[PDB]
Each structure stands twice: as structure tokens, then as C-alpha cells.
Amino acid sequence: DLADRFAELERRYDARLGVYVPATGTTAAIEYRADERFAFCSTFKAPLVAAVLHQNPLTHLDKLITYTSDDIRSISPVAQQHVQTGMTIGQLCDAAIRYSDGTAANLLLADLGGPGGGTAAFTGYLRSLGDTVSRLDAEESELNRDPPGDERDTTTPHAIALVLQQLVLGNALPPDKRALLTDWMARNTTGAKRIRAGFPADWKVIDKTGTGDYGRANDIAVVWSPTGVPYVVAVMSDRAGGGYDAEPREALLAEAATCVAGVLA
Secondary structure, eight states, X not given: OHHHHHHHHHHHHTSEEEEEEOOOSSOOOEEESTTSOEEOGGGGHHHHHHHHHHHSOGGGGGOEEOOOGGGOOSOOTTGGGXXXXXXXXXXXXXXXXXXXOHHHHHHHHHHHOSSGGGHHXXXXXXXXXXXXXXXXXXXXXXXXXXXXXXXXXXXXXXXXXXXXXXXXXSSSSOHHHHHHHHHHHHTOSSOTTTHHHHSOTTSEEEEEEEEOSTTOEEEEEEEEOTTSOEEEEEEEEEOGGGOTTOOOOHHHHHHHHHHHHHHHO
16 A cells, blocks of 8 residues: 555655645545654745735835845855845745745744744744644754754644645635745745656646755645646655764655655546
């Protein structure tokens, strides 16, 4: 059965794999370790942008945010080029999703306001959507440690898949805001070797990745069949057993996604 295939990927990659695909009118749910916790890594940046879209009118996307060198934390491919000029909220949303810009994500968290530099506001947003599992505790920083077993900054494939489904396919955002989220995810630059690589080229794929130490490698996606039928695919992985320096394995996520594609096609 399907569980056997995922368990075989775990054995082969020396990894823990989590998979969830919400049930639909056309498919039963796919679940493997779907209610086990995995580090968000950068996958929270997609619902983060949704929180920002939700909390403001769309005119807010043109608000210019300025910041300094002291705000550059973690890989920030876009934000590192605009220290002098600043970036709009919309530009930050773009960067946070499409380039996993950490500084962009921290500035969006700030834009949410409230305690913890926005991490509470973000978590409250998830709570609002019906997610009582996921939590963000910590801003982006390349100095962050997050050892296995710590519940901080974690979600579950089940929880994050239901969130993404509400955001992109459901009614959590009005259509004008929904379209921006979808488009940013559709033009992501970081995901070509994960879920995208497990689905035939005639499927549409939009996604948001995350990568971390302990071999952490995640991808959350919405896919559309060649006949236009959408599904949400969350695949999360780590290799806590190999320690801090365990290599993330994108191919694990591609191959999990291949299994999923088989069930859905």
C-alpha cells in the first residue's frame, strides 16, 4: 500500500517524511505522519503573506517600508539589494514567497504588529483559520537553533495543508487578495526540485519551500490536474537522526510527490 512506499522512502533517505493531501470531491485524503510535528522552516512565509493580505486593504501593498543593514537576517536575496531604497509591503510579499526572503518575512511579521515581533499575530491568524496546532515563535535568523523535539516553530502536514487549501482554494481571502497569493506561489523560484519535480509537466504547480538544518526539507503546494482539478500537497521531511549537519534531500520530496501524483492522476 501507499504507506509502504512512503516508509520505503524514509528507509532509503534515512529520513522522516510527512505527507498530507486533503480529501476532495474527487479523492480520499492522502496522509502519512500527517499529524506529526515538523519544523515550518520557510513554509510559514506563504500564510504570513495571507495574514498581511487579510489584515489590510490591498492599497496597503504600496506602503514603503525602510530598514537597515541590522535588519538583514538570513538569506534575503531581494531585501539585501534595497537597503537604501526600501521595499513596499507588496514587494516584500513577493520576495518572501518567491525568493524565501527572510528579511522580507521579518518585516511582514513586524507589519502584523503585536508581541513577539509579529509571531503571535501570525499564530493567531492560523488559529483564526481553525489551525490549533501550528505555532511560530521565532523570527527569521541564520543564528536560530531549533533542535528536534522542540514544538516551537512547527506545524503538521495536516494542519498546513488545510491552511493552504483555505487560503488558495477556499474562502479565507476575497478573490482579489487570493489571486495575489496564488500568483506569487505560482512564480516561486525555489521549488523546481521538490513537488514540481514529482508531478507531470501538464500539471500546474504553485508552492512554497522550506529548508533547515537536521536535514529539514519541506514543500507545500497547490497543484491542478491537466483537466483543472486542484489538490493541496504538503510534504515535510527531516533527518534528525543524522544530527545538525544532516543534508536535506530534495529528491525525497520529489519522490513522495510522485507517489501522490500516482494516486491523484
